[PDB]
Write a protein that binds this ligand. Structure first.
Ligand SMILES: C[C@@H](c1ccc(Cl)cc1)n1cnc(-c2ccccc2)c1-c1c(C(=O)Nc2cccnc2N2CCC(N3CCCOC3=O)CC2)[nH]c2cc(Cl)ccc12
Ligand SMILES: C[C@@H](c1ccc(Cl)cc1)n1cnc(-c2ccccc2)c1-c1c(C(=O)Nc2cccnc2N2CCC(N3CCCOC3=O)CC2)[nH]c2cc(Cl)ccc12
Lengths: 93, 93
Protein backbone atom coordinates (compact mmCIF):
# COMPACT_ATOMS: atom_id res chain seq x y z
CA UNK A 1 0.00 0.00 0.00
CA UNK A 2 1.27 3.51 -0.86
CA UNK A 3 2.47 5.14 2.37
CA UNK A 4 0.28 8.18 1.66
CA UNK A 5 -3.00 6.21 1.70
CA UNK A 6 -2.05 4.11 4.70
CA UNK A 7 -2.83 4.56 8.40
CA UNK A 8 -0.94 2.23 10.73
CA UNK A 9 -2.25 1.38 14.20
CA UNK A 10 -0.49 -0.30 17.13
CA UNK A 11 -1.97 -1.76 20.33
CA UNK A 12 0.04 -1.04 23.52
CA UNK A 13 0.43 -3.83 26.09
CA UNK A 14 -1.26 -3.26 29.49
CA UNK A 15 1.64 -1.42 31.20
CA UNK A 16 2.39 1.01 28.35
CA UNK A 17 -1.38 1.62 27.96
CA UNK A 18 -1.69 2.54 31.64
CA UNK A 19 1.25 4.94 31.16
CA UNK A 20 -0.28 6.56 28.05
CA UNK A 21 -3.65 6.87 29.80
CA UNK A 22 -1.90 8.38 32.84
CA UNK A 23 -1.23 11.44 30.65
CA UNK A 24 -4.67 11.79 29.02
CA UNK A 25 -4.86 9.00 26.43
CA UNK A 26 -8.31 7.40 26.06
CA UNK A 27 -8.20 4.73 23.35
CA UNK A 28 -6.56 1.32 22.87
CA UNK A 29 -4.93 1.70 19.48
CA UNK A 30 -2.66 4.50 18.26
CA UNK A 31 -0.39 5.52 15.46
CA UNK A 32 3.30 5.53 16.48
CA UNK A 33 3.28 9.36 16.38
CA UNK A 34 0.41 9.31 18.89
CA UNK A 35 2.33 6.96 21.20
CA UNK A 36 5.37 9.30 20.89
CA UNK A 37 3.17 12.34 21.63
CA UNK A 38 2.02 10.79 24.93
CA UNK A 39 5.47 9.40 25.82
CA UNK A 40 6.89 12.90 25.22
CA UNK A 41 4.27 14.29 27.54
CA UNK A 42 5.01 11.70 30.20
CA UNK A 43 8.73 12.51 30.07
CA UNK A 44 8.11 16.29 30.23
CA UNK A 45 5.57 16.17 33.08
CA UNK A 46 7.65 13.82 35.25
CA UNK A 47 10.74 15.91 34.38
CA UNK A 48 12.75 12.79 33.50
CA UNK A 49 15.02 14.65 31.07
CA UNK A 50 18.27 16.07 32.50
CA UNK A 51 17.88 19.88 32.81
CA UNK A 52 21.65 20.28 32.13
CA UNK A 53 21.83 17.71 29.30
CA UNK A 54 18.29 17.83 27.90
CA UNK A 55 18.88 14.99 25.44
CA UNK A 56 19.32 12.28 28.13
CA UNK A 57 16.28 10.78 29.85
CA UNK A 58 16.88 9.28 33.32
CA UNK A 59 14.10 6.79 34.04
CA UNK A 60 15.58 4.24 36.50
CA UNK A 61 13.23 5.24 39.33
CA UNK A 62 10.24 5.47 37.01
CA UNK A 63 7.88 2.97 35.34
CA UNK A 64 9.33 4.04 31.99
CA UNK A 65 12.61 2.37 33.07
CA UNK A 66 10.68 -0.86 33.67
CA UNK A 67 9.01 -0.69 30.27
CA UNK A 68 12.23 0.16 28.47
CA UNK A 69 14.61 -2.01 30.55
CA UNK A 70 17.35 0.64 30.82
CA UNK A 71 18.21 3.21 33.52
CA UNK A 72 18.43 5.97 30.87
CA UNK A 73 18.55 6.63 27.13
CA UNK A 74 19.25 9.38 24.57
CA UNK A 75 16.31 11.02 22.74
CA UNK A 76 18.67 11.42 19.76
CA UNK A 77 18.79 7.66 19.24
CA UNK A 78 15.47 7.05 17.49
CA UNK A 79 15.88 3.41 16.43
CA UNK A 80 16.72 2.35 20.00
CA UNK A 81 13.55 4.09 21.21
CA UNK A 82 11.37 2.40 18.57
CA UNK A 83 12.87 -0.97 19.54
CA UNK A 84 11.99 -0.32 23.20
CA UNK A 85 8.41 0.64 22.27
CA UNK A 86 7.93 -2.45 20.04
CA UNK A 87 8.53 -4.63 23.13
CA UNK A 88 5.42 -3.06 24.65
CA UNK A 89 3.09 -3.66 21.69
CA UNK A 90 0.56 -6.50 21.40
CA UNK A 91 1.23 -8.81 18.44
CA UNK A 92 -2.00 -8.61 16.41
CA UNK A 93 -1.03 -10.64 13.29
CA UNK B 1 7.09 -1.53 13.02
CA UNK B 2 7.13 -5.36 13.13
CA UNK B 3 4.41 -6.62 10.77
CA UNK B 4 2.97 -8.78 13.56
CA UNK B 5 2.17 -5.82 15.85
CA UNK B 6 0.86 -3.63 13.06
CA UNK B 7 -2.70 -3.02 11.85
CA UNK B 8 -2.97 -1.08 8.59
CA UNK B 9 -6.12 0.85 7.68
CA UNK B 10 -7.17 2.36 4.34
CA UNK B 11 -9.95 4.86 3.58
CA UNK B 12 -11.95 4.14 0.39
CA UNK B 13 -12.92 7.06 -1.85
CA UNK B 14 -16.68 7.82 -2.13
CA UNK B 15 -17.45 5.46 -5.05
CA UNK B 16 -15.62 2.41 -3.69
CA UNK B 17 -17.17 3.09 -0.25
CA UNK B 18 -20.67 3.10 -1.75
CA UNK B 19 -19.82 -0.22 -3.44
CA UNK B 20 -18.50 -1.79 -0.21
CA UNK B 21 -21.54 -0.54 1.71
CA UNK B 22 -23.81 -1.92 -1.03
CA UNK B 23 -22.78 -5.40 0.19
CA UNK B 24 -23.07 -4.84 3.96
CA UNK B 25 -20.04 -2.75 4.92
CA UNK B 26 -20.70 -0.15 7.64
CA UNK B 27 -17.48 1.71 8.44
CA UNK B 28 -15.16 4.17 6.65
CA UNK B 29 -11.77 2.55 7.17
CA UNK B 30 -10.75 -1.04 6.50
CA UNK B 31 -7.79 -3.34 6.31
CA UNK B 32 -7.00 -4.44 2.73
CA UNK B 33 -8.27 -7.95 3.57
CA UNK B 34 -11.59 -6.40 4.60
CA UNK B 35 -11.83 -4.45 1.32
CA UNK B 36 -11.05 -7.72 -0.55
CA UNK B 37 -13.70 -9.58 1.48
CA UNK B 38 -16.39 -7.09 0.39
CA UNK B 39 -15.12 -6.86 -3.21
CA UNK B 40 -15.22 -10.68 -3.36
CA UNK B 41 -18.78 -10.57 -2.15
CA UNK B 42 -19.74 -7.92 -4.68
CA UNK B 43 -18.28 -9.99 -7.52
CA UNK B 44 -20.01 -13.20 -6.33
CA UNK B 45 -23.44 -11.63 -5.76
CA UNK B 46 -23.49 -9.77 -9.09
CA UNK B 47 -22.15 -12.94 -10.76
CA UNK B 48 -19.43 -10.97 -12.59
CA UNK B 49 -17.08 -13.96 -12.81
CA UNK B 50 -17.32 -16.11 -15.96
CA UNK B 51 -19.08 -19.39 -15.04
CA UNK B 52 -17.00 -21.22 -17.71
CA UNK B 53 -13.68 -19.50 -16.89
CA UNK B 54 -14.13 -18.65 -13.20
CA UNK B 55 -10.84 -16.75 -12.96
CA UNK B 56 -11.92 -13.90 -15.29
CA UNK B 57 -14.15 -11.10 -13.98
CA UNK B 58 -16.23 -9.25 -16.61
CA UNK B 59 -17.18 -5.85 -15.20
CA UNK B 60 -17.66 -3.54 -18.23
CA UNK B 61 -21.38 -3.06 -17.58
CA UNK B 62 -20.86 -2.69 -13.84
CA UNK B 63 -19.66 0.09 -11.52
CA UNK B 64 -16.62 -2.08 -10.73
CA UNK B 65 -15.48 -1.48 -14.35
CA UNK B 66 -15.70 2.28 -13.71
CA UNK B 67 -13.68 2.02 -10.51
CA UNK B 68 -11.07 -0.25 -12.05
CA UNK B 69 -10.98 1.32 -15.55
CA UNK B 70 -10.92 -2.02 -17.42
CA UNK B 71 -13.67 -4.12 -19.04
CA UNK B 72 -12.37 -7.26 -17.26
CA UNK B 73 -9.45 -8.66 -15.25
CA UNK B 74 -8.00 -11.93 -13.93
CA UNK B 75 -8.36 -12.76 -10.21
CA UNK B 76 -4.99 -14.56 -10.51
CA UNK B 77 -3.19 -11.27 -11.09
CA UNK B 78 -2.99 -9.89 -7.55
CA UNK B 79 -0.66 -6.92 -8.06
CA UNK B 80 -2.87 -5.54 -10.85
CA UNK B 81 -5.88 -5.77 -8.52
CA UNK B 82 -4.07 -3.99 -5.67
CA UNK B 83 -3.02 -1.23 -8.10
CA UNK B 84 -6.66 -0.79 -9.17
CA UNK B 85 -7.81 -0.59 -5.53
CA UNK B 86 -5.10 1.95 -4.58
CA UNK B 87 -6.62 4.36 -7.15
CA UNK B 88 -9.80 4.32 -5.06
CA UNK B 89 -8.18 5.10 -1.70
CA UNK B 90 -8.05 8.52 -0.02
CA UNK B 91 -4.50 9.80 0.52
CA UNK B 92 -4.32 10.35 4.30
CA UNK B 93 -0.61 11.23 4.73
C1 LIG C 1 11.58 14.70 17.82
C2 LIG C 1 11.04 13.99 19.11
C3 LIG C 1 11.26 12.48 18.94
C4 LIG C 1 10.39 11.67 18.17
C5 LIG C 1 10.63 10.30 18.04
C6 LIG C 1 11.73 9.73 18.69
CL1 LIG C 1 12.04 8.02 18.54
C7 LIG C 1 12.60 10.52 19.45
C8 LIG C 1 12.37 11.89 19.58
N1 LIG C 1 11.56 14.51 20.41
C9 LIG C 1 12.53 15.40 20.46
N2 LIG C 1 12.78 15.68 21.66
C10 LIG C 1 11.90 14.93 22.51
C11 LIG C 1 11.98 15.05 24.01
C12 LIG C 1 13.27 15.32 24.53
C13 LIG C 1 13.46 15.44 25.91
C14 LIG C 1 12.36 15.30 26.76
C15 LIG C 1 11.06 15.02 26.25
C16 LIG C 1 10.88 14.90 24.87
C17 LIG C 1 11.15 14.21 21.65
C18 LIG C 1 10.06 13.22 21.93
C19 LIG C 1 8.70 13.18 21.70
C20 LIG C 1 7.86 14.19 21.03
O1 LIG C 1 6.67 13.93 20.83
N3 LIG C 1 8.49 15.33 20.66
C21 LIG C 1 8.14 16.48 19.93
C22 LIG C 1 7.33 16.29 18.79
C23 LIG C 1 6.98 17.38 17.98
C24 LIG C 1 7.47 18.63 18.32
N4 LIG C 1 8.26 18.80 19.41
C25 LIG C 1 8.62 17.77 20.22
N5 LIG C 1 9.45 18.03 21.34
C26 LIG C 1 8.67 18.47 22.54
C27 LIG C 1 9.51 18.53 23.85
C28 LIG C 1 10.76 19.41 23.55
N6 LIG C 1 11.64 19.64 24.71
C29 LIG C 1 12.55 18.61 25.22
C30 LIG C 1 13.18 18.89 26.61
C31 LIG C 1 13.56 20.38 26.62
O2 LIG C 1 12.42 21.20 26.35
C32 LIG C 1 11.64 20.89 25.30
O3 LIG C 1 10.91 21.81 24.92
C33 LIG C 1 11.58 18.85 22.36
C34 LIG C 1 10.70 18.81 21.09
N7 LIG C 1 8.21 12.04 22.13
C35 LIG C 1 9.16 11.26 22.68
C36 LIG C 1 9.05 10.00 23.28
C37 LIG C 1 10.26 9.46 23.77
CL2 LIG C 1 10.23 7.89 24.49
C38 LIG C 1 11.50 10.12 23.68
C39 LIG C 1 11.59 11.40 23.10
C40 LIG C 1 10.39 11.92 22.61
C1 LIG D 1 -7.67 -15.46 -2.97
C2 LIG D 1 -8.73 -14.36 -3.35
C3 LIG D 1 -7.96 -13.09 -3.74
C4 LIG D 1 -7.42 -12.21 -2.79
C5 LIG D 1 -6.73 -11.06 -3.19
C6 LIG D 1 -6.58 -10.79 -4.56
CL1 LIG D 1 -5.72 -9.37 -5.07
C7 LIG D 1 -7.11 -11.66 -5.51
C8 LIG D 1 -7.79 -12.81 -5.12
N1 LIG D 1 -9.75 -14.76 -4.36
C9 LIG D 1 -9.68 -15.90 -5.01
N2 LIG D 1 -10.66 -16.00 -5.79
C10 LIG D 1 -11.49 -14.84 -5.66
C11 LIG D 1 -12.73 -14.67 -6.50
C12 LIG D 1 -12.68 -15.27 -7.78
C13 LIG D 1 -13.78 -15.17 -8.64
C14 LIG D 1 -14.92 -14.48 -8.21
C15 LIG D 1 -14.98 -13.88 -6.93
C16 LIG D 1 -13.88 -13.98 -6.07
C17 LIG D 1 -10.85 -14.09 -4.73
C18 LIG D 1 -11.23 -12.75 -4.18
C19 LIG D 1 -11.62 -12.28 -2.95
C20 LIG D 1 -11.78 -13.04 -1.70
O1 LIG D 1 -12.06 -12.43 -0.67
N3 LIG D 1 -11.60 -14.38 -1.79
C21 LIG D 1 -11.56 -15.45 -0.88
C22 LIG D 1 -10.91 -15.23 0.35
C23 LIG D 1 -10.78 -16.26 1.28
C24 LIG D 1 -11.29 -17.51 0.95
N4 LIG D 1 -11.89 -17.72 -0.25
C25 LIG D 1 -12.04 -16.74 -1.18
N5 LIG D 1 -12.69 -17.05 -2.40
C26 LIG D 1 -14.18 -16.93 -2.30
C27 LIG D 1 -14.91 -17.03 -3.67
C28 LIG D 1 -14.42 -18.33 -4.37
N6 LIG D 1 -15.07 -18.62 -5.66
C29 LIG D 1 -14.73 -17.88 -6.89
C30 LIG D 1 -15.70 -18.08 -8.09
C31 LIG D 1 -16.06 -19.58 -8.11
O2 LIG D 1 -16.63 -19.99 -6.85
C32 LIG D 1 -15.99 -19.64 -5.72
O3 LIG D 1 -16.33 -20.29 -4.74
C33 LIG D 1 -12.88 -18.35 -4.53
C34 LIG D 1 -12.21 -18.26 -3.14
N7 LIG D 1 -11.79 -10.97 -3.00
C35 LIG D 1 -11.55 -10.49 -4.23
C36 LIG D 1 -11.65 -9.17 -4.71
C37 LIG D 1 -11.33 -9.01 -6.07
CL2 LIG D 1 -11.38 -7.41 -6.74
C38 LIG D 1 -10.94 -10.07 -6.91
C39 LIG D 1 -10.87 -11.38 -6.43
C40 LIG D 1 -11.18 -11.54 -5.07
Amino acid sequence: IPASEQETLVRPKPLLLKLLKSVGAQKDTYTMKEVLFYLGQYIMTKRLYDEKQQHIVYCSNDLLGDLFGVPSFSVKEHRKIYTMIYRNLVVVN
